[PDB]
Each structure stands twice: as C-alpha cells, then as structure tokens.
Design a binder for this molecule. Structure first.
Ligand SMILES: [Ca+2]
Ligand SMILES: [Ca+2]
Length: 316
C-alpha cells in the first residue's frame, strides 16, 4: 500500500495497550514503513491460504478481540527487527532489509506458529493449550530467527542440525524477550501456553528435563519422530547456552557465567560465520569456541566458559 505513515493504538493478546505503526490510505493498514522495507501483517480469516488480506482498519484503533493477535504480531516483529539492528547490526532477516510479513488467524484452533520460508504464520490456539501465539514475544522472535538461520547457516531441519536450528531460535527468542524487558525468563512460550495453568511453559532452557527434554548428550533421542527430535534434542544446546550465560554446576561440571550479551555475540557470530547446513553438535561446539576466541582471545574466560558448558552437556 502507498500512503501516509501514522501511529495507531490497540490492545494485545494479554490485554496490554500499545502503539503501533500504521499506514493511512482510505483505511488504516498494519503496514510499518519505519523499519527496512516494511513490516506487514495480514488477516488469514481462519483459512489456510496465505498470506491473506493486508490488515485494514477503519479508525486506527485496534481494541477488538479479533484485532489482538494482529497487534502483537505487528508490534513484536518491530521489536525483533530492532533487536537485530541495534544489537547485531543486521538489517532484517536477510541483512538487506527484506520486508517482514506475518499472517494471523490462521486456520481454526491451530496450536502452533512457524516461519514458512517466506513469512510468519500464527494460529489462535484452541484456547486451552494455547491462546493466540503472537502474544508471546519469545515465540515471535523464535520464529523470526528461523528466517535469519535460513539466510545464513541454512541448518537443515532434521537430526542434529535441526535441533541446532531450534536451539538458536530459542536462544535468540529469549535474548529478545530480555531486550524488551518483557518479564524475561529462560522459559519458552510461558505467556501463551495453558492459560488455566500458571507457572508452566512449552520448554525450559534452564532445566529442559522439567518438560522431558534431554539436558545431556547421553540422553539424546535417536528415533524418528519430530524430524529426529528437533524439539527434543534442542534441550541439550539450550542447556549449554543457559550455562554459558548464567553459570552453574551440571552433572558435576562447573561453569562460570559470562552473561547474556556475550552469549548473544558468540552465538550470532557462530551462526553467521561458522555453521553450515549440515553442522552437528560437535561442530557447533567448535564454532562456538572459535567465535569466542575471535571475539575475546583464546586464553579468555569467555573461551573457557564455552568449553566448560559443552563439557557439562556432554558435547565433545
Ligand atoms: Ca520466555
Ligand atoms: Ca500456562
């Protein structure tokens, strides 16, 4: 759409009010001209055909229940774009300011969200297992990071490489949640998962085993489900990343934490300079060690912590 940039206001899935960047041309559209080539949000009107219609609103006010998921998808993609730009100096997922597109209200009672190779897609949830998935900034940023991976390392979605791909998305989705300072934690999806149950979440990076995911290479899943356990074995890497950041003792191996910022720097460098489509866990360790080395010197504590963390999860 071609029009005048403006700012509207609405309420997101959690009931919080926020301002969003819109475009005016007869209607007010969810089109944000302030970031790269634009952030565009679409209505999939409960169907599976994509992208759907660009979101149009008559009065620039987005307080309807039906508007909530679009408000958050649009807003949270802006935050994610901001994180990448400000923190890592990367312009959009492709590094060249590609437009960011998302569709909401996908299907009916769809309990998932994903990057499809071209855009983001978010279900509304069935209202029991999930509420609309774009209400979770970690979920939005996790999905958008899959686009960053596609343009960079290109990790194939299966087996070890697939679990790497997943862990990267959880790591960065969590880093973005801390960046926005939105009640940050080391859990994934807590804000939109099981509305009736307080205290849980989809996955935990601090303690993957809490939800039955492995926290040591010895416990890795070797079957064929889930594309070879992409959502299971990611817990091993997630746990290593938690330890690099926060520190701790895990299976008797002690790790000194080096903090979130460095965690993000090391990982981004690994992802963008060293990983390849077929990278395995062991190659990830090497990439991470090398990145830390590059960044901080080989006799650095940073390097040391990266080694200790992978040793702790049994990755050689
Ligand atoms: Ca979280
Ligand atoms: Ca819950």
């Amino acid at each position: 759409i071609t029009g005048t940039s403006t700012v509207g206001v609405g309420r997101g899935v959690l009931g919080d009010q926020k301002n969003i960047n819109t475009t005016y041309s007869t209607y007010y559209y969810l089109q944000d001209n302030t970031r790269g080539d634009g952030i565009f949000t679409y209505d999939a009107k409960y169907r599976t055909t994509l992208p759907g219609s660009l979101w149009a609103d008559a009065d620039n006010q987005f307080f309807a229940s039906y508007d909530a998921p679009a408000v958050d998808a649009h807003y949270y993609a802006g935050v994610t774009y901001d994180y990448y730009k400000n923190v890592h100096n990367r312009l959009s997922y492709d590094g060249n300011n590609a437009a960011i597109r998302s569709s909401v209200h996908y299907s009916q009672g769809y309990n998932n969200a994903f990057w499809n190779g071209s855009e983001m897609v978010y279900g509304d949830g069935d209202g029991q297992t999930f509420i609309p998935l774009s209400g979770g900034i970690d979920v939005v940023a996790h999905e958008l990071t899959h686009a960053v991976t596609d343009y960079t390392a290109g990790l194939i979605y299966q087996n070890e490489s697939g679990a790497i791909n997943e862990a990267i998305s959880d790591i960065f989705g969590t880093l973005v949640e801390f960046y926005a300072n939105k009640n940050p934690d080391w859990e994934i999806g807590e804000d939109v998962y099981t509305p009736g149950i307080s205290g849980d979440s989809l996955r935990s990076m601090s303690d993957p085993a809490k939800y039955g995911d492995p926290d040591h290479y010895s416990k890795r899943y070797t079957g064929t489900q889930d594309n070879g356990g992409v959502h299971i074995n990611s817990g091993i890497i997630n746990k290593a990343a938690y330890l690099i950041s926060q520190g701790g003792t895990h299976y008797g191996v002690s790790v000194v934490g080096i903090g979130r910022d460095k965690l993000g720097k090391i990982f981004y460098r690994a992802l963008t300079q060293y990983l390849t489509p077929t990278s395995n866990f062991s190659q990830l360790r090497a990439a991470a060690v090398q990145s830390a080395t590059d960044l901080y010197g080989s006799t650095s504590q940073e390097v040391a912590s990266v080694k200790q963390a992978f040793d702790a999860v049994g990755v050689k």
